[PDB]
Design a protein around this ligand. Structure first.
Ligand SMILES: [Cl-]
Ligand SMILES: [Cl-]
Lengths: 197, 195
């Protein structure tokens, strides 16, 4: 199967109690795996069959896009988190956030507001925009900043209901608050360095 | 000002097809929250003196999202009931036979549409201007009144919060279960008015 589900970099329970093992089980092994299985079915007998996931995402529309972009968004989501993470940013991203938001607390406040405010299925992003500045963006359904060409993804947070409904029911804000304990600044730093190159 | 309409049945009335816990969150958190958010949004606007349908028709963005979701959810609750489901009866049965060939045909296609919808949205049975029943889907808070695509007859919510407590990712089992709840009486009332 041309497209393979990338492994999580940590155990299924590694984000607990912020996001439960049960959530990771459904979200990764059911939803995420499902988008991979679905895309592989869809790209058969198309020119997409031999393109990379990223190329498919950038060049498709309809169901192919929806599945391709979701696979990519989820992998970026999992990599945006980790055990032994969260807290204050550190390394290059700490200083960049200071420059572009004034403080980590300012960034945290605006990001949480955006994440809490998104109507329907979607994603909040920290991105390096096309003017070399960190900004917060939101996208709807499977959308992302690479497809939109609105900047280079640094971190993402999924706010589709399946991301939090097991653990928090309707209480998205509690999910967003808990997510701050999981934010992987090492990942952000890796993305920033590539982005600025 | 805008008021949340009463359910026509108790919170457990749809169980086990939709749990009482689901109805509790869906009605008392989601549906109630749409009403509360809308009232805060329309205070001090020309929308404060308009009906829900008028607000729905004349708004965009947050006001639309909340107003349409209030109307959509009431239509959803009224589209179900205890003592409902199974084979259609009365005028809607005949009309489904005319427009879909059979109930089995309707049921399978409606199910496909409900299961196939990507992200948050709704499936609809509506009567169009040629007095023909048709299946529509809409995204997020969208609906056929906003869209002028026909007079709604029934709806089914496929937002994840509709089923996630009871079925997790298995939307098709929720859809299957929903057929034990579909309120043919409400369909017949709607059809009588629409025709
Ligand atoms: Cl589990
Ligand atoms: Cl009935």
């Amino acid at each position: 199967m041309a497209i393979i589900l990338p492994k999580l970099k940590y155990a299924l329970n590694a984000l607990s109690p912020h996001i439960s093992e049960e959530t990771l089980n459904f979200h990764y092994n059911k939803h995420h795996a499902g988008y991979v299985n679905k895309l592989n079915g869809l790209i058969k007998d198309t020119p997409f069959a031999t393109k990379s996931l990223v190329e498919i995402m950038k060049e498709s529309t309809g169901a192919i896009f929806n599945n391709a972009a979701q696979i990519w968004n989820h992998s970026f989501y999992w990599d945006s988190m980790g055990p032994n993470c969260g807290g204050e940013p550190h390394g290059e991203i700490k200083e960049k956030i200071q420059e572009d938001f004034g403080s980590f607390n300012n960034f945290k406040n605006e990001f949480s507001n955006v994440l809490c405010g998104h109507f329907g299925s979607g994603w909040g992003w920290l991105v390096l925009n096309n003017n070399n500045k960190l900004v917060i963006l939101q996208t709807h359904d499977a959308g992302n900043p690479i497809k939109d060409n609105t900047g280079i993804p640094i971190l993402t947070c999924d706010i589709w209901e399946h991301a939090y409904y097991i653990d928090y029911r309707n209480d998205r804000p509690s999910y967003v608050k808990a997510w701050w304990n999981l934010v992987n600044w090492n990942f952000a730093n890796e993305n920033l360095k590539k982005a600025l190159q």
